[PDB]
Amino acid sequence: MYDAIVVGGGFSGLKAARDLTNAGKKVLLLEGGERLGGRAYSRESRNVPGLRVEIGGAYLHRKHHPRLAAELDRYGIPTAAASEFTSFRHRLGPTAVDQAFPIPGSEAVAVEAATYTLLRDAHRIDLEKGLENQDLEDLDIPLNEYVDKLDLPPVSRQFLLAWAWNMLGQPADQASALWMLQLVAAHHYSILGVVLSLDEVFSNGSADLVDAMSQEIPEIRLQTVVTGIDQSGDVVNVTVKDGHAFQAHSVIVATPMNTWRRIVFTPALPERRRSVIEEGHGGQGLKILIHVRGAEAGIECVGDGIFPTLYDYCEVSESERLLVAFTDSGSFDPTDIGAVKDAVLYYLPEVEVLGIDYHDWIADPLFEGPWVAPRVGQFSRVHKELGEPAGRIHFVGSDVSLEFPGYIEGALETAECAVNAILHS
Amino acid sequence: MYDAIVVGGGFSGLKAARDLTNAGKKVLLLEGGERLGGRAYSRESRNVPGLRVEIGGAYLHRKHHPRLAAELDRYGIPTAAASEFTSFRHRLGPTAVDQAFPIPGSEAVAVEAATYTLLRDAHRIDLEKGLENQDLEDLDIPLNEYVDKLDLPPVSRQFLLAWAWNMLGQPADQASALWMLQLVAAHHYSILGVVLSLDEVFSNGSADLVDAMSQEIPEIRLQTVVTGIDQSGDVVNVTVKDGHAFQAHSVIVATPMNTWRRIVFTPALPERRRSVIEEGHGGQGLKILIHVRGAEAGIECVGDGIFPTLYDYCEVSESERLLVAFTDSGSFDPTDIGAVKDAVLYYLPEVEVLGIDYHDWIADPLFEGPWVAPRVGQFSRVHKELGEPAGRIHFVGSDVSLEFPGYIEGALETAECAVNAILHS
């Protein structure tokens, strides 16, 4: 038996396991898949043999992500500027200006006013309290109705919605306005900063950091899928798909929220949590890497397309590139390459699609989801509690960060908190 | 004796006199100068024989100034676009961009945040209540300290201050932050709109409208300076510099605030008002028309100069133009043409100054002031009351508008209110 079993070897699980280990605890990390890193996933391109791509989370920003910054600095891991945008090919109507901030002067007054409203509303959110504990139900409504009430003129309206679609991985009619304001709050109460935090990448991929952290963890078992967590007795018993149980004083669940429903907890989790857990969050972020010919470097496209955003990812050769598109998986089928072509050509009619690459996060039984975004109505009923212990079982991860959900920083933040709690208990 | 004597033949006095007349009242208008219009003053250029210039207030904006819009529409008076700016020659440092909105992307986050703060603060102001009745003393502090607390980076900082200097006619250390927020409030809670309201001019000058209104006023006496207003008896007695008194049931003071102290009121005005009246407001707006050679059309310059703003006014010929500069009269001497040259050449080193033209509003005994701006501490002690009746004596004018002070619209607004009050009393 161990002092702690950690379930899940994403960044959250890795940090917790590492830190408990370094604190002198006896730790086992159980990871259900064949790799470490979780929703941080670097691997070879499907389209471009020999080329390493990030298929999940990729971007960071040092001033918004100090814990992550500290990890990079600790292991001497190199970062690079995200691809600079020098060419703008928006679809935001005839009045839009082709630069990164495409709002024209005729919309300036409207944007001023919306800026006040958005930030006023965001400033209602105290990041420590939880979205259910703050009288915020009035904001937990579909994003499209919230945005309809701002009544923005066409460019700023569509610009806002496009980025929101990108960032939440939901169409406007399914996103919650409250969660959008939560992201704004998380970025130091900045709308702009939500997008500006696409600031740096890992020079050699996220696996750099995954590997650095894992090297400090002495006991890891891959291909070990947890099916049961039973704290009915004096010591927690952790059951496993094809294997003998493991035992520990504490257990940290560092798996994705939408997988929790596939574990049998004994006794059952507190009843306030159960229906959100059963239903899962609503995130449907879909990130497509698109192999192209005929695109020049440095393109950014934002607009009203089925791809709200389409922009430069990497140079493949002198004629060839990867672009990245964001949409959602409920609205778009990535295996329909004709559809992909239509979506690309909308913005970029000179561009030939050679190929697409993506990971089906939703179909992956170890995830059942990309990054977190709540269904409408969900987080103003229960949010904070999802990330709180039940007895000796801790819940961590990006999905449950109050401070930085949906980002790697939130994985690190939640782990830090569980670690500290254990070292006192 | 009359139903009403109106003292002052600016736009306020003219409206009141006209409207009372049309309501069937017996009205006398007493104007101390040789002309009607007051701080709206079109006349021939001192520099350019044959050329008509506005030496006082010139600009309007129809959506912020509905009463003025109604006057123009009533008399069929034509307006034109203010001179469009197509060339930008700012002095806001090396990071500024040469367009009308010169803030660079690196300052965007800071501007976002300041935008929230400025508008939050402005939104404390209810325009009907008066600046003394709203618990706003904390904002009534020098503008430079208010702006120091926003802690803006260099371009947006200096851009804000320059326009504030323009608009208030005070240097930052003497302007009140509260009054700046009042202007923001007056423009539908818009910072931007303060500047955007420089939207149209009178095609043929303000005298167009002055003349139209005066034609509807049957009794006017020019060169008639009021020295005394005595409501001790049943009927008000109005004494006059070199002349027989006049009598009326009501009297409307439509002279500038800073002239009130040169009238003997009997009985004395309510004592809360008296010290502000004695001291006068702090406005020192200085508008200089500058005759130039070597300037191309469409120039706008904003910066850190002794002239915060310098921009295109009118074409004089193919080589010659008028520019307009704003500063204040405490900081700059307009009769020092060498100084003028230095101020111009700062922004525009290719430009030869031929001549300057201005009116000394401060030295003019019928004004003792350009447009209103309070001294620090003044309007959060007494503001609303300055524009309220004392007995049968009414006080009107731009200077005392709660809704649009410092503008022609406020003259019209205050008059409307006095008229209505009289027609009921």
Ligand SMILES: Cc1cc2nc3c(=O)[nH]c(=O)nc-3n(C[C@H](O)[C@H](O)[C@H](O)COP(=O)(O)OP(=O)(O)OC[C@H]3O[C@@H](n4cnc5c(N)ncnc54)[C@H](O)[C@@H]3O)c2cc1C
């Ligand atoms: C398309 C996409 C793009 C993204 N882009 C960014 C970005 O740009 N910047 C950013 O900061 N973040 C990004 N993210 C968000 C970020 O990657 C994740 O929020 C984060 O990595 C989650 O880490 P975690 O430790 O909470 O969980 P995960 O990384 O999901 O780790 C959970 C682990 O649990 C394992 N597991 C699941 N079930 C079991 C079981 N029963 N037993 C044992 N193990 C199990 C999984 O295999 C996995 O390794 C992105 C995510 C996606 C999906």
Ligand SMILES: Cc1cc2nc3c(=O)[nH]c(=O)nc-3n(C[C@H](O)[C@H](O)[C@H](O)COP(=O)(O)OP(=O)(O)OC[C@H]3O[C@@H](n4cnc5c(N)ncnc54)[C@H](O)[C@@H]3O)c2cc1C
């Ligand atoms: C340089 C400058 C630029 C401006 N630019 C703009 C602008 O762009 N847009 C805008 O809307 N506004 C502008 N204004 C503000 C606007 O012009 C004034 O606020 C407005 O015209 C005031 O009108 P009023 O009727 O309140 O007073 P005034 O126009 O000042 O009229 C007062 C009248 O009282 C008379 N008078 C004084 N003492 C006596 C006495 N004892 N007896 C008899 N008569 C007396 C004066 O001769 C005068 O005719 C500007 C003002 C200045 C000074």
Ligand SMILES: NCCc1c[nH]c2ccc(O)cc12
């Ligand atoms: N690598 C993908 C980065 C990314 C783009 N848009 C996003 C929105 C949310 C998020 O967590 C991450 C992202």
Ligand SMILES: NCCc1c[nH]c2ccc(O)cc12
């Ligand atoms: N004609 C001058 C217009 C003008 C320029 N700046 C100003 C500031 C305040 C004001 O009332 C008027 C103005």
